[PDB]
Amino acid sequence: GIGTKILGGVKTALKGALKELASTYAN
């Protein structure tokens, strides 16, 4: 229920936003 935070939320954030930001910082 609040497992959503460490599943659907944080793992989506690393999968999308950190993966895109770090990838086009490193280039």
Curated annotation (Swiss-Prot):
It comes from the Eukaryota. The modification Asparagine amide is found at residue 27. The record marks 16 as: Important for flexibility. Antibacterial peptide with amphipathic alpha-helical structure that has activity against both Gram-positive and Gram-negative bacteria. Also shows antimicrobial activity against the fungus C.albicans, but not against A.flavus nor P.uticale. It has little hemolytic activity. It possess a significant cytotoxicity against tumor cell lines, but does not possess a significant anti-HIV activity. Also shows high spermicidal activity. This is Maximin-1. It comes from Bombina maxima. The lineage of its organism: Eukaryota, Metazoa, Chordata, Craniata, Vertebrata. The chain holds residues 44 to 70 of 144 of the full protein.
